[PDB]
Amino acid sequence: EWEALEKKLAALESKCQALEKKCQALEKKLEALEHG
Amino acid sequence: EWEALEKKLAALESKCQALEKKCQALEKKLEALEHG
Amino acid sequence: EWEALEKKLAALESKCQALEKKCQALEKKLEALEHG
Numbered sequence: 001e002w003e004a005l006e007k008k009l010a011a012l013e014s015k016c017q018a019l020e021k022k023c024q025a026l027e028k029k030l031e032a033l034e035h036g
Numbered sequence: 037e038w039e040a041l042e043k044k045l046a047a048l049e050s051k052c053q054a055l056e057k058k059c060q061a062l063e064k065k066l067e068a069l070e071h072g
Numbered sequence: 073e074w075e076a077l078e079k080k081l082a083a084l085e086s087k088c089q090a091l092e093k094k095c096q097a098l099e100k101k102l103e104a105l106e107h108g
């Protein structure tokens with residue numbers, strides 16, 4: 001169905017946004033090690 | 037077409053899941069450096 | 073609408089591709105710390 005698709009996409013957008021944050025968090029910890 | 041969309045979404049869900057694992061793998065290596 | 077969906081998916085595919093690169097970039101910096 002069409003609606004199931006809309007929900008899969010919506011959950012993917014969330015997953016993606018949570019991944020961008022995780023990456024920013026990781027980069028921050030990596031930068032701490034790399035400079036200090 | 038509708039079916040092409042369904043396939044693009046399915047491949048995106050896989051890509052996303054592989055990215056969550058990569059991030060978990062990275063965080064693990066980062067935590068090793070950060071504590072030991 | 074159908075077209076709005078197509079655009080959301082297209083922007084998600086980009087976001088995902090940019091995340092794979094970020095992860096590769098991070099892993100590269102992490103590997104530098106881990107071996108050198």
Ligand SMILES: [Zn+2]
Nearest residue numbers: 030031034035
């Ligand atoms: Zn740096």
Ligand SMILES: [Zn+2]
Nearest residue numbers: 066067070071
């Ligand atoms: Zn830690």
Ligand SMILES: [Zn+2]
Nearest residue numbers: 102103106107
């Ligand atoms: Zn290594």
